[PDB]
Specification:
binds ligand U64; mainly beta; Cathepsin D, subunit A, domain 1; endoplasmic reticulum; membrane; 5 helices; six-stranded mixed barrel; EC 3.4.23.46; 41% strand; 380 residues; five-stranded mixed β-sheet
């Protein structure tokens, strides 16, 4: 799948996007890859933040669905007009499909000032599509209309001390993007890419919580979120343990809450005082799990645009949640992640591009024996 390697671009903290074309003749747009939503939604009006936008009046293949949609989020929102058009991915499979497109005509706190993307490719399932599950997501249309296999994989390559990159392999797996073996965890339910965490360790020390807390009220894999978000109670325990592990240096309380940065002299970040973080995931077999481990290089994120400082500044990118665990870019930048929809499972392997040092690397290890893993899932 050499044609698709390195087909993702982005800037630190602004997301990973793929080039797409919409309409006839084709209009090229940069589109954020989002496993945490299920709409294909593109700027269609001259918002000043946008490099370009979808001009339906130029497309002979545009079809109006004569239906609008209003999509509010916890902060910000977008509103759009639904239709269909022909869509292709230049550095993807050599096909064209007719897909739903939400033409965004009003938004707030949605587009990012300074970013180079103009829309979002929601790769999750129809149950969470807006306005309802009758709006077929893009990937469903792709698979239905072509012979592309029903899976995709993501290698998100992060940065350290602004340009990120990676690969979205559509319809398969490229073995050059990972080392070791893939380990799979079941997709618990096809809405978000929902998974079940069965154990959490900080530098190998179990947090010893009731594992339902780790998945209250869900745990998901989301390329459209930067942080590792943890349920409030889990975040409290995790930070207590990370604070203790890292206690040879003291930091203001506000740093751990994401309320302020911490800066060090260039090149002197003390990586070794910060612990590794391990999530054990439900395995494929009864009573079997595996673990994924990330480094501070993943969860301490460089902040480049700090005019008021001259040093190397970082943001703590593990944060508390009210929506469950969110394995965002902090997790995904450590791994090659296989969204094996056909077999309702997600594979993890150590990413051949993840950021590490000479002493520690990200890891995917198993098998481990874990009992009562079904009890870890939350039910209303
Ligand atoms: C559509 C939405 C969304 C995402 C985004 C994503 C980004 F801006 C972004 C930025 C940096 C990085 C990195 N590294 C990655 N992504 C930018 C805008 C944006 F809207 N998608 C999400 N995954 S989070 C989101 C949300 O709250 N939900 C809950 C309801 O179900 C769908 C997702 C805000 C939603």
């Amino acid at each position: 799948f050499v044609e698709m390697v390195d087909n993702l671009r982005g800037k630190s903290g602004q997301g990973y996007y793929v080039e797409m074309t919409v309409g006839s003749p084709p209009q090229t747009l940069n589109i954020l890859v989002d496993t945490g939503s299920s709409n294909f939604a593109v700027g269609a009006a001259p918002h000043p933040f946008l490099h370009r936008y979808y001009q339906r009046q130029l497309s002979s293949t545009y079809r109006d669905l004569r239906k609008g949609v209003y999509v509010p989020y916890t902060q910000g929102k977008w509103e759009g007009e639904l239709g269909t058009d022909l869509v292709s991915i230049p550095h993807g499979p050599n096909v064209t499909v007719r897909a739903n497109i939400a033409a965004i005509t009003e938004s707030d706190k949605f587009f990012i000032n300074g970013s180079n993307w103009e829309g979002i490719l929601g790769l999750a399932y129809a149950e969470i599509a807006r306005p309802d599950d009758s709006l077929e997501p893009f990937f469903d249309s792709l698979v239905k209309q072509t012979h592309v296999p029903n899976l995709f994989s993501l290698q998100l390559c992060g940065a350290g001390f602004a340009s990120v990159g990676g690969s979205m392999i559509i319809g398969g797996i490229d073995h050059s993007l990972y080392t070791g073996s893939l380990w799979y965890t079941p997709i618990r339910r096809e809405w978000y890419y929902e998974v079940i965490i069965v154990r959490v360790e900080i530098n190998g020390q179990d947090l010893k919580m009731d594992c339902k807390e780790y998945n209250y009220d869900k745990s998901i894999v989301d390329s459209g979120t930067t942080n590792l978000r943890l349920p409030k109670k889990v975040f409290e325990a995790a930070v207590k343990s990370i604070k203790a592990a890292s206690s040879t240096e003291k930091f203001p309380d506000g740093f751990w809450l994401g309320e302020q940065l911490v800066c060090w002299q260039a090149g002197t970040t003390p990586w070794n005082i910060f612990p590794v973080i391990s999530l054990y995931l439900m395995g494929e077999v009864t009573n079997q799990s595996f673990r994924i481990t990330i480094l501070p290089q993943q969860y301490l994120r460089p902040v480049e645009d700090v005019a008021t400082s001259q040093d190397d500044c970082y943001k703590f990118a593990i944060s508390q949640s009210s929506t469950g665990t969110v394995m965002g870019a902090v997790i995904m930048e450590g791994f090659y992640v296989v969204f094996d929809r056909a077999r309702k499972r997600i594979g993890f392997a150590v990413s051949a591009c993840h950021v590490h040092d000479e002493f520690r690397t990200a890891a995917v290890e198993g098998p481990f024996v874990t009992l009562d893993m079904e009890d870890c899932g939350y039910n209303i």
